[PDB]
Design a protein around this ligand. Structure first.
Ligand SMILES: Nc1ncnc2c1ncn2[C@@H]1O[C@H](COP(=O)(O)OP(=O)(O)O)[C@@H](O)[C@H]1O
Ligand SMILES: [Mg+2]
Length: 358
């Protein structure tokens, strides 16, 4: 006890966590990989909307030893903001450490604990990276829902879930108080994690990750989202972030499509004194993404000739209109609790973590 049980899925867009709440169920959220330097003091998922925290950790160095930061969404609106840099084709570690530690703190505050030991269950694209996380980290909230709260994080042990079925555990198992099998259900399989800026095409063969064939591409949803937003604004001539677009406009329609196959979705945007029906625009981009993913998945199927192909990530949901065809394809496996497809990997790491502590 006094222990936070979580799976940690960190990328360049978001830092994702799936953890056990007080009622023993899985709780998931994400913190954008964005930080900004902040003054020592104050100036669904509401508690992460304003993250102004002080972090004391030996995993940080230089003029970041022990100071205050704006983290995630609230950092994105700062001129100072630091984001992952990408060429036209470490020691930026605080970009990843800070949102990571922050997510641990937020989770701890959610379950009402001030001091948590956190066995690290994550993944990488081992011990060298784990030792970068070892030690004691204090996170103090200077604003927001948990203002004045001080959380002491202790990371003694961990794993990066490299080999075995650890990465795929969420395809078969859930945690409802703990620890049950999924309501519906080979030796060589591919896990395709369809993400925002990336697509992870991993191939597991005989209990082993095939490090040769396991590839990673920039085939994400963001480019297709960008295009849709270009055509919407152009249709008028609205949304602050892509997440805003996904949350306010897309997610409600996708959920309706999930829980009822006869439902045809509608997309209308209210901008100024004008309201436009842009259903055709959004659907075009969705299917374009689906078709492109269909093509990408097939040629990876052929390259590995895996027995089964598992498709996960938020891309499954964003392109559900087209990608739901995979449910009637033998050799393709969509998660059955498809509503939780975005947090598949972090949920897998969480389940692997609970099994470790048993
Ligand atoms: N329920 C949903 N409906 C529609 N789109 C979603 C849903 N959940 C996530 N997405 C979208 O799917 C894309 C992939 O998200 P995700 O896999 O979480 O990215 P990453 O793992 O790279 O951070 C994102 O653009 C996200 O906005
Ligand atoms: Mg991801």
């Amino acid at each position: 006890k006094n222990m936070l049980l979580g799976g940690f899925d960190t990328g360049n867009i978001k830092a994702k966590i799936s953890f056990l709440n007080e009622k023993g169920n899985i709780e998931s959220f994400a913190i954008p990989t964005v930080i900004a330097e902040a003054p020592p003091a104050k100036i669904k998922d509401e508690d992460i909307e304003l993250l102004h925290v002080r972090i004391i950790s030996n995993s940080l160095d230089g003029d970041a030893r022990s100071r205050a930061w704006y983290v995630g969404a609230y950092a994105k609106d700062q001129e100072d903001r630091q984001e992952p840099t990408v060429d036209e084709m470490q020691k930026n570690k605080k970009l990843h450490l800070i949102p990571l530690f922050t997510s641990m703190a937020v989770a701890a505050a959610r379950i009402g604990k001030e001091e948590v030991s956190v066995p690290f269950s994550g993944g990488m694209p081992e011990e060298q990276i784990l030792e970068m996380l070892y030690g004691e980290h204090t996170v103090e909230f200077l604003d927001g829902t948990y203002e004045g709260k001080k959380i002491k994080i202790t990371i003694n042990d961990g794993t990066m879930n490299v080999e075995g079925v650890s990465s795929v555990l969420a395809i078969l198992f859930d945690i409802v108080n703990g620890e049950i099998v999924e309501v519906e259900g080979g030796e060589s399989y591919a896990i395709n994690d369809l993400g925002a800026g990336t697509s992870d095409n991993a191939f597991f063969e005989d209990g082993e990750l095939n490090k040769k064939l396991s590839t990673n591409t920039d085939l994400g949803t963001n480019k297709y989202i960008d295009e849709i937003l270009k055509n919407i604004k152009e249709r008028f001539m609205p949304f602050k972030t892509r997440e805003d677009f996904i949350q306010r406009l897309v997610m409600p329609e996708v959920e309706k499509m999930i829980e009822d196959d006869t439902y045809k979705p509608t997309f209308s945007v209210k901008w100024g004194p004008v309201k436009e029906n842009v259903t055709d625009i959004v659907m075009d981009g969705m299917l374009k993404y689906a078709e492109d993913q269909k093509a990408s998945l097939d040629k990876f199927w052929d390259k590995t000739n895996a027995d089964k192909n598992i498709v996960v990530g938020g891309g499954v949901l964003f392109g559900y209109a087209g990608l739901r065809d995979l449910k009637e394809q033998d050799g393709f496996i969509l998660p059955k609790n498809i509503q939780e497809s975005a947090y598949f990997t972090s949920r897998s790491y969480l389940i692997a973590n609970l099994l470790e502590q048993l």
